[PDB]
Symmetry: C2
Subunit: 223 residues, 2 copies
């Protein structure tokens, strides 16, 4: 395996997977993956990430607690929304993603109950046997959050290298107090959760193909 070919395979191969088989990732493989992810760089080598990996009965209790919190409207998000977050082309991209996702699920925007069933399953980690909750310092701002993203991508690519599918989910961070209470975590903010395991390649949702903007839209070269 040539390095240039390997990076293309990992980077393009990793996709947000929304339906998993129940089979667990072997403990030795999970150890190798999370050890490798720790090699992510960060400002001054601060490594601000605190990662809680949940499996088995603890993962089942956590899924049920999230479903209950969602039903009781107990939203406890650590990161507030900022006005005008997605305007212009950012809004166009979100709308296009939403349309492709709902078309792959076979759901129309007006089918409120079907959107509910789908979102209940999202809180059950899309059936994934494992979830990694990415906690960050209480004073996390843009620079620290950037490092949390560097880590998240290092982890997802290390998972892809071992045939482990993943879904990064901001949704899980909307019930941060529930995650903290279940896991006994104190004085840390929850940025996202990453559901992981082995993809169910028969699920239509895993056939969704999300495009990218391309060089003309993202990059400029000057000399």
């Amino acid at each position: 395996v040539d390095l240039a070919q390997a990076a293309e395979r990992l980077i393009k191969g990793r996709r947000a997977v929304r339906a998993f088989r129940p089979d667990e990732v072997p403990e030795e493989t999970m150890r190798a993956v999370f050890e490798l992810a720790g090699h992510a760089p960060s400002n001054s080598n601060t490594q601000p990430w605190h990662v809680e990996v949940v499996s088995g009965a603890a993962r089942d209790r956590l899924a049920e607690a999230l479903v209950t919190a969602h039903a009781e409207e107990r939203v406890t998000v650590d990161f507030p929304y900022r006005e005008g977050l997605f305007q212009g082309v950012l809004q166009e991209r979100r709308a296009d993603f939403g349309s492709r996702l709902y078309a792959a699920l076979g759901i129309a925007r007006d089918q409120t109950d079907l959107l509910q069933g789908y979102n209940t399953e999202s809180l059950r980690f899309y059936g994934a046997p494992h979830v990694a909750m990415l906690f960050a310092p209480n004073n996390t701002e843009a620079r620290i959050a950037g490092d949390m993203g560097i880590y998240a991508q290092t982890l997802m690519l290390a998972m892809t290298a071992h045939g482990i599918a993943s879904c990064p989910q901001a949704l899980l961070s909307f019930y941060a107090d529930t995650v903290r209470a279940e896991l006994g975590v104190e004085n840390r903010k929850l940025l996202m959760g990453i559901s992981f395991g082995y993809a169910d390649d028969t699920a239509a949702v895993n056939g969704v193909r999300i495009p990218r903007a391309g060089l003309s839209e993202t990059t400029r070269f000057s000399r």
Copy 2:
């Protein structure tokens, strides 16, 4: 196999602080930046705007940064206040600094040497190219997280083609200077990434920065 190749990329990438003058071939640069675009993001928003600078334009930019620093014209879009890092995070920062400054041969009391080192850092460590990572005006934690996803995708794509890199928060302390030299408006500068081919004869490139143990950053429960 793929598992070994991922280990080689993730562990092989290091912050390189001395470069050869040789340029990255244009076709390789286009392939690397197109591959980096495959980074995921919230709702596929892809909030990144990247300015890649080379040749005479890179020289003019480096000299403008050197001048801004010498004149104390610091302009920051994202604050970096002292005390941002506490407890173990502060000790990891101090431990890194002790390792870096020992490799550079610069003591804590050497103001003239620290100034000379910072001048070279604003000259992108002699790298033939620099990528300036611009983010939306209203960037907060979630959007910044996506910028980080992109930055790591880009650095690993570079490593795969034997391209060395150094992410630099330092360059974001002269945001108005970078904006003016590049004709950029209404975007915030998060960081710069200097890149090219490592000068393997430089002592600074021999530094190996460790990581906290898996037991220190990760907790498994069932």
